[PDB]
Here is the input.
Amino acid sequence: SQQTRVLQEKLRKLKEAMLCMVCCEEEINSTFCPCGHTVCCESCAAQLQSCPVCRSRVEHVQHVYLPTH
Amino acid sequence: SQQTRVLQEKLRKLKEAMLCMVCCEEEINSTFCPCGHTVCCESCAAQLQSCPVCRSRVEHVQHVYLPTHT
Ligand SMILES: Cn1ncc(Cl)c1C(=O)N1CCCCC1
Ligand SMILES: [Zn+2]
Ligand SMILES: [Zn+2]
Ligand SMILES: [Zn+2]
Ligand SMILES: [Zn+2]
Here is the structure.
């Protein structure tokens, strides 16, 4: 039905929100500290000296173990 | 259709996985450091001395801003 198409789009968008905002290919699993923005995979997070959301300096990257992983 | 029911179930399960493992009511937005388990809301994370998943000592809690926050 048309509702099947609507639900497929909602699921696709929720899954895309869990993917790295830089490479778009790997799951988010890293937090920039101290700002807390959690928007990258470990490979993209390792290559950024400043947060891509707020431009704060990255003091270090904390790996996150999420239940959605 | 039955396909619509299957997709509704998938969506519901993904949304439930984003909720705090202790209160089951608020979104996860806190990480236990240094272990990295990110399974609680701020209130529930605040008084735990050890991680509820791996038992490691909680040195501090890091707030996390996730793109899925609704
Ligand atoms: C230009 N740049 N500087 C740091 C990072 Cl990260 C990037 C970046 O956009 N990419 C593309 C996707 C894969 C990782 C590298
Ligand atoms: Zn990436
Ligand atoms: Zn930031
Ligand atoms: Zn809670
Ligand atoms: Zn832990």
Notes: Residues 2-63 of chain B form a domain with the Herpes Virus-1 fold (CATH 3.30.40.10). Residues 27 and 70 of chain B are 8 Å apart (CA to CA). Chain B touches chain A through 29 residues (CB under 8 Å).
